Amino acid sequence: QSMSVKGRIYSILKQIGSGGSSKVFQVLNEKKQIYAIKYVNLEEADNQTLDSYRNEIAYLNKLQQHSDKIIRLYDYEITDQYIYMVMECGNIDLNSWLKKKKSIDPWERKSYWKNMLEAVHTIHQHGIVHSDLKPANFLIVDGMLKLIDFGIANQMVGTVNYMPPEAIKDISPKSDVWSLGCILYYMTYGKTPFQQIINQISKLHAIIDPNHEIEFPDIPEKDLQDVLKCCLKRDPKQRISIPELLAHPYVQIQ
Ligand SMILES: CCc1nn(CCOCCOCCOC)c(CC)c1NC(=O)c1ccn2c1CCc1cnc(Nc3ccc(N4CCN(C(=O)COC)CC4)cc3OC)nc1-2
């Protein structure tokens, strides 16, 4: 119920996240300030894994100044057994909140989409394709949305629902546009595009079969309907680019 990271001592309040060999805590510094610490455990970490983590941290740290739609990382300590990462404490990850939330105020959802693009666009500039975006990857801070991770590090929920067809036979920035697509879709018709389907092989075949009409129910926002149709184009060159998505009317026009 208390840790030290580069000497400084943080008092845990609760555990606000967990995965792989990693806990995330909500904590207080000396000046009674709040943070999130991600403890990562390395005692079972193979070499490539150990690099993957060093890489992912390298980058998280870097693209701090290149954008505020990326979770802040204030400090880290790193040794052969553990990594501790001192980030800002968000309110909730997107995915938890989408679950609880009734329907989403159109203005909020568009605002959020703008941050998904700002964030993701940043990492593509730097060579990174995330190639595994789900709601879980984004954290609401001060009603603003930030990318947490860059999919660079290895693992220790399986989920095919956000997966772009061109990687249902195995890298492009277009892969992330699909996933962001499914995230927006989720935020729009309250489901992912291939959720109804339960047979995960029937599903995997649905995502690649151009014979499969993806439905996009009529909604007031014709701006928004376009963007979904545009992001969910099974051919990666058919698909809309992110610099295109940032000038799109849905995100551009009042
Ligand atoms: C921890 C397992 C994991 N592995 N990876 C992959 C890479 O990391 C492992 C390798 O090491 C490299 C480091 O990568 C950064 C990721 C990315 C999504 C995850 N998830 C996270 O890192 C991860 C998940 C959440 N966080 C983080 C990091 C920073 C943070 C700040 N703030 C928050 N805030 C927050 C998040 C969640 C919540 N709860 C929990 C969810 N809600 C519930 O419904 C309760 O049920 C569990 C209630 C709200 C409350 C919060 O505020 C107090 N959350 C996180």
Side-chain angles (χ1 to χ4, degrees):
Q1 176 236 30
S2 179
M3 30 189 68
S4 156
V5 194
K6 311 291 276 146
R8 312 229 207 265
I9 296 191
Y10 309 84
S11 24
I12 298 182
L13 322 185
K14 51 148 148 128
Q15 159 155 328
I16 65 164
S18 99
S21 305
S22 79
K23 332 217 139 290
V24 183
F25 302 114
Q26 165 186 236
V27 320
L28 297 177
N29 74 353
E30 290 92 296
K31 295 209 185 195
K32 289 293 219 197
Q33 267 155 330
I34 201 168
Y35 294 105
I37 285 180
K38 179 150 166 187
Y39 151 90
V40 158
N41 185 75
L42 296 177
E43 178 275 338
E44 296 219 312
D46 69 279
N47 263 21
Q48 77 201 38
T49 294
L50 269 178
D51 211 82
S52 89
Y53 295 162
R54 281 179 216 120
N55 205 222
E56 158 100 54
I57 298 193
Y59 272 103
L60 176 63
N61 202 72
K62 189 129 169 280
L63 335 167
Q64 290 261 97
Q65 300 109 343
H66 302 246
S67 153
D68 80 309
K69 291 322 178 279
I70 293 190
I71 189 191
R72 305 338 288 164
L73 176 67
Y74 295 105
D75 205 356
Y76 65 93
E77 190 183 293
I78 181 159
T79 60
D80 295 323
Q81 322 94 43
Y82 67 80
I83 306 183
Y84 300 159
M85 281 189 280
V86 174
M87 295 134 139
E88 63 192 338
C89 195
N91 312 90
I92 165 157
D93 65 294
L94 182 53
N95 179 78
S96 286
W97 180 88
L98 279 190
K99 286 193 296 184
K100 294 156 201 186
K101 189 71 188 292
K102 294 189 163 183
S103 50
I104 318 86
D105 164 27
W107 159 83
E108 178 170 59
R109 152 186 37 179
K110 175 189 292 206
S111 154
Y112 285 182
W113 183 247
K114 290 149 167 188
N115 305 336
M116 271 158 269
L117 298 193
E118 215 228 84
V120 169
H121 179 227
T122 311
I123 74 189
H124 287 192
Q125 287 176 323
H126 283 267
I128 302 135
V129 167
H130 186 298
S131 36
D132 211 75
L133 295 157
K134 299 139 294 125
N137 291 101
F138 285 108
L139 165 95
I140 318 217
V141 194
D142 24 65
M144 181 160 77
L145 262 215
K146 309 164 142 259
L147 197 54
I148 293 162
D149 99 298
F150 312 145
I152 284 170
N154 301 337
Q155 45 180 58
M156 305 263 211
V157 182
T159 190
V160 158
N161 256 312
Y162 296 83
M163 189 171 291
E166 72 261 44
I168 292 66
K169 70 281 294 211
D170 254 26
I171 196 54
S172 194
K174 300 304 202 56
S175 309
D176 285 339
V177 172
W178 180 277
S179 343
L180 286 171
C182 314
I183 296 186
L184 190 53
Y185 197 112
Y186 187 20
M187 299 174 97
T188 285
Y189 311 133
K191 304 200 170 189
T192 60
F194 298 91
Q195 186 156 304
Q196 337 83 240
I197 298 179
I198 328 192
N199 273 7
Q200 302 211 129
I201 306 197
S202 289
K203 199 177 290 212
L204 284 164
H205 273 262
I207 296 147
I208 49 164
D209 188 8
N211 273 8
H212 193 283
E213 287 271 310
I214 316 184
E215 296 194 342
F216 303 82
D218 265 294
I219 49 164
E221 313 211 61
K222 276 284 219 292
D223 265 1
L224 187 60
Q225 209 176 288
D226 182 279
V227 189
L228 307 179
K229 298 218 183 194
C230 260
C231 291
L232 313 188
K233 293 263 191 129
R234 300 199 170 86
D235 163 2
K237 297 168 204 185
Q238 272 275 261
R239 209 170 303 151
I240 191 190
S241 94
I242 281 201
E244 274 151 19
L245 283 162
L246 292 156
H248 192 281
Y250 171 69
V251 44
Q252 268 320 341
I253 267 169
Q254 191 263 132

